[PDB]
Design a protein around this ligand. Sequence first.
Ligand SMILES: CC(C)(C)[C@@H](CC(=O)O)Nc1nc(-c2c[nH]c3ncc(F)cc23)ncc1F
Length: 150
Amino acid sequence: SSFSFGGFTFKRTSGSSIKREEEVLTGNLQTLKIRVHEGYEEFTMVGKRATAILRKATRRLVQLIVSGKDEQSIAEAIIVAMVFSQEDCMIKAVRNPMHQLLRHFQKDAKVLFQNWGIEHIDNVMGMVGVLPDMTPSTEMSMRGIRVSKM
Ligand SMILES: CC(C)(C)[C@@H](CC(=O)O)Nc1nc(-c2c[nH]c3ncc(F)cc23)ncc1F
């Protein structure tokens, strides 16, 4: 049971979710009603120029491993995963509604990427950390984001 979002074909590989219509507050203190998916799920994200493995819980991205043609393709996949995750820091970075959030971050993901948070990494090799400005790092990455070689 496959579906499409932001140019990516998502396929659930594990888990399940139930939906709950919920009201969330953006960084401008605007109320949006979104359909929240509750549960732990794992997906493949297949696009024309990037592919990824996403693991998420309710409104929380656990891990995203991205592969792609270049920085732009990879960033494009990261934006979709972050919006898809429904995380509160993604909603707070704003300063069908899922498509509206996506269209907003696609224009400029600078605030999304800053506000997301950064973490120290272990060096699983063949996977690199990526900084908010898309520079690769072997020490630090945006929370749960890893870049894999094509
Ligand atoms: C991708 C998008 C078009 C916005 C959503 C809208 C919806 O909730 O129906 N569509 C689908 N999401 C998920 C789905 C499954 N798990 C999810 N977790 C978070 C999330 F935002 C969506 C999902 N699964 C199947 C879908 F068709």
